[PDB]
Amino acid sequence: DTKEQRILRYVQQNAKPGDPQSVLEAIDTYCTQKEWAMNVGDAKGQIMDAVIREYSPSLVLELGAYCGYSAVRMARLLQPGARLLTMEINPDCAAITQQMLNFAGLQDKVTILNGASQDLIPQLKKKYDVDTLDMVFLDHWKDRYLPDTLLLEKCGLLRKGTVLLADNVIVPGTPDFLAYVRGSSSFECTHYSSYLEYMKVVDGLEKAIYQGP
């Protein structure tokens, strides 16, 4: 029994089927109160929602599905016919994410790709009927943000105006990626400051009164 399975089961038991907002709220409650997990969380999530709404992307790529929190967050805001592709190298995570999406009623909008980016990015256009991406959400291993961006470019998946949106550029940090995009004339960058997810961390003092030998 893993933390991720506990999160899914919590959702199935507490959230309302076919209600994405309910699913997000259940995940957030569980991770706030019971076990920290690396979901983007509500604070950063509200910023994501505002960016998605602004750009109204027809085709989004997510790198890093985890438990499907951001996939639910993004897919619930997609217009009819728009698609989210989400890449997850861990097959246990990919299965949890599919179940989370199913529970939320968002399965028709989302395609889970189970594999490594080095294999899957070059197969996107041919296997998943993609021309160029409107938006990319980066939230996988932090050392993979830059090499994957470069691979996306190599493969012709970026067009003028493709929006990349990257989580965790402060904590844990993505320093090569951040320096690269901020220094490149090929990118125009904006920073949205917020807070790391679920950081009300409990600690305590123990008092121990000696009673003698």
Ligand X SMILES: O=C(NC/C=C/[C@H]1O[C@@H](n2cnc(C(F)(F)F)c2)[C@H](O)[C@@H]1O)c1cc([N+](=O)[O-])cc(O)c1O
Residue 160 annotated to the active site:
no
- For residue 169, give the DSSP letter: I
- For residue 130, give the DSSP letter: -
Q: Are the beta carbons of 104 and 71 closer than 8 angstroms?
A: no
Q: Which region among 68-76, 108-116, 142-150, 159-167 touches Mg ion (by CB under 5 A)?
A: 159-167
Residue 19 annotated to the active site:
no
Residue 196, Cα to own-chain centre: how many angstroms?
A: 13
In the bound complex, what is the minimum distance in angstroms from residue 207's beta carbon to ligand X? 31
Q: How many Cβ atoms sit within 10 Å of the Cβ of residue 87?
A: 22
**Is there binding between residue 167 and Mg ion (CB under 5 A)?**
yes
Q: Residue 105: which region, alpha, beta or left (left: phi > 0; alpha: psi -120 to 50)?
A: left
Give the amino acid at 209.
Answer: I
Residues 6+ apart with CB under 8 A from 116: 89
**Is there binding between residue 194 and Mg ion (CB under 5 A)?**
no
Binding site for ligand X (CB under 6 A): 38, 63-64, 66, 87-90, 93, 116-117, 139-141, 144, 167-168, 171-172, 196-197
Residue 35 annotated to the active site:
no
Residue 142 annotated to the active site:
yes
Residue 49 annotated to the active site:
no
Task: Say which entry of Mg ion, ligand X, none residue 90 contacts (CB below 5 to 8 A, set by partner kind).
Answer: ligand X
- What's the residue count for the chain? 213
Q: How many angstroms separate the CA atoms of 100 and 7, rounded?
A: 10
Q: How many angstroms separate the CA atoms of 6 and 69, rounded?
A: 14
C-beta of 171 vs 205, nearer to ligand X: 171
In the bound complex, what is the minimum distance in angstroms from residue 210's beta carbon to ligand X? 39
The catalytic residue among 28, 62, 88, 139 is 139
Q: How many angstroms separate the CA atoms of 28 and 155, rounded?
A: 36
**Is there binding between residue 102 and Mg ion (CB under 5 A)?**
no
- CA distance from start to end of the chain: 43
Task: Say which entry of Mg ion, ligand X, none residue 109 contacts (CB below 5 to 8 A, set by partner kind).
Answer: none
C-beta of 57 vs 64, nearer to ligand X: 64
C-beta of 131 vs 143, nearer to ligand X: 143
C-beta of 19 vs 134, nearer to ligand X: 134
Q: Which region among 1-9, 80-88, 160-168, 181-189 touches Mg ion (by CB under 5 A)?
A: 160-168
Catalytic residue ranges: 139, 142, 167-168, 197
